[PDB]
Amino acid sequence: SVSKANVPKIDVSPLFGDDQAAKMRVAQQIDAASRDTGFFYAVNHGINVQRLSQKTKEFHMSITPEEKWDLAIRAYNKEHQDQVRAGYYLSIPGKKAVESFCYLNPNFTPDHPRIQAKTPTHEVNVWPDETKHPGFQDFAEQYYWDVFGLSSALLKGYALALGKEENFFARHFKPDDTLASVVLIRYPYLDPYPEAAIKTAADGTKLSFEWHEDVSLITVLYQSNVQNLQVETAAGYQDIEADDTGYLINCGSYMAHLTNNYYKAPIHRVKWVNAERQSLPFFVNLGYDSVIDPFDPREPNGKSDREPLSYGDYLQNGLVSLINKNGQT
Ligand SMILES: CS[C@H](O)[C@@H](OC(=O)[C@H](C[SH]=O)NC(=O)CCC[C@H](N)C(=O)O)C(=O)O
Ligand SMILES: [Fe+2]
């Protein structure tokens, strides 16, 4: 068998308030989890995840092939050269099971200075027709802001955990400019399940998505109640229990860079499961020009031999690299 990873449940509600000592006690738990397997569940987060899941299902099960082409990113539709990030990521029956819809900051409108400048990694979201998907765009944009709020609270906990003031990350995480994304991923039930859409790990485990570190500062993930994630530890890959009431939190490789690997970006992978399920990550990305000077909380003077990296540079290069490593999703 495979052993269960230690993934503690942390009540993050104090991070929304003004009880400083309580917030430090949360920060301690985040530091412990970040130093151990790298994962925890955030509980008492305030978001209505059941409704998220229901609205997302209604979308995934009603969108049609026609709409998917019309919304498709460039990798699927050459007419959409501006859609590198945002839009529909199609399945390929018989070959590729997963499909998804990605959207960015709702404030990236046509008049946004970064959109006007055509700055990489900034795009205007694309949406289905309102009459075919009533309420969906409004729901989804509101979700963005709900999960942005949660992520800002979590960032105050990570900051305190690392010995910094609580706005150390959050001051770079701002509504007008964040590069954060929501991805609404559908993993289908298929009978028969084509083997070409199943990858095999070196240990024999059947996978839907291969080992990786996340391209994020942190990742704030809702998933259905179907076990599938595994984390590499010193003792090997361990299963992450599902919990469709909490958000699964981990660091991405920007956090690893900024902390000199004190908070590692944990390596993880997605087991193949023949189950209709959802995976709804929010990738907590900063602004394009955000730079945090790297540091090391294990060294007395806090100094690091890493060089500063702008978030936009990080992001543009990370997203390409992960496509090259593990394939276009
Ligand atoms: C449990 S790994 C993850 O949440 C999810 O996989 C992803 O979303 C992958 C790796 S991080 O998980 N991420 C990407 O493919 C990056 C999408 C980025 C997006 N297209 C953007 O432009 O921001 C899954 O397959 O269940
Ligand atoms: Fe991931």
Side-chain angles (χ1 to χ4, degrees), residues 19-162:
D19 183 334
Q20 318 302 330
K23 288 188 192 166
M24 291 292 281
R25 292 184 286 274
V26 178
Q28 185 283 320
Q29 296 175 74
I30 290 171
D31 178 72
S34 300
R35 297 163 58 188
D36 184 18
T37 65
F39 285 91
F40 65 97
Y41 274 111
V43 300
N44 308 105
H45 53 67
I47 298 179
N48 186 345
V49 292
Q50 182 285 337
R51 185 166 182 261
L52 167 68
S53 181
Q54 177 66 34
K55 296 294 180 180
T56 299
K57 180 183 55 26
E58 289 168 3
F59 172 69
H60 279 144
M61 304 309 167
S62 68
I63 192 166
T64 63
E66 179 189 40
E67 295 178 277
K68 301 174 189 179
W69 290 125
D70 291 0
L71 297 175
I73 62 167
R74 185 213 315 187
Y76 299 100
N77 182 338
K78 293 205 160 85
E79 298 183 11
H80 296 169
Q81 289 301 310
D82 289 338
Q83 294 182 237
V84 178
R85 298 178 70 191
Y88 212 90
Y89 292 50
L90 283 68
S91 70
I92 309 179
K95 305 284 185 190
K96 174 178 179 282
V98 68
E99 62 189 278
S100 65
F101 173 78
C102 174
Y103 60 103
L104 308 182
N105 192 334
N107 293 322
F108 293 168
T109 46
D111 61 12
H112 187 287
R114 294 289 193 173
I115 298 293
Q116 286 287 313
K118 297 187 165 315
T119 299
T121 76
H122 305 77
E123 303 174 13
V124 182
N125 291 332
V126 299
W127 299 100
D129 284 355
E130 175 67 29
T131 57
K132 295 190 172 49
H133 295 272
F136 172 72
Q137 175 177 353
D138 296 322
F139 176 78
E141 286 183 335
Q142 182 62 60
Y143 179 66
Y144 193 102
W145 298 120
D146 289 351
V147 70
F148 180 102
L150 169 60
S151 294
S152 291
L154 295 170
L155 289 179
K156 289 177 192 177
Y158 276 98
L160 291 174
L162 287 161

Side-chain angles (χ1 to χ4, degrees), residues 198-213:
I198 304 173
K199 303 135 202 305
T200 308
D203 75 6
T205 303
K206 294 176 170 155
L207 303 177
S208 287
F209 193 69
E210 263 284 20
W211 72 268
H212 67 286
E213 298 179 348

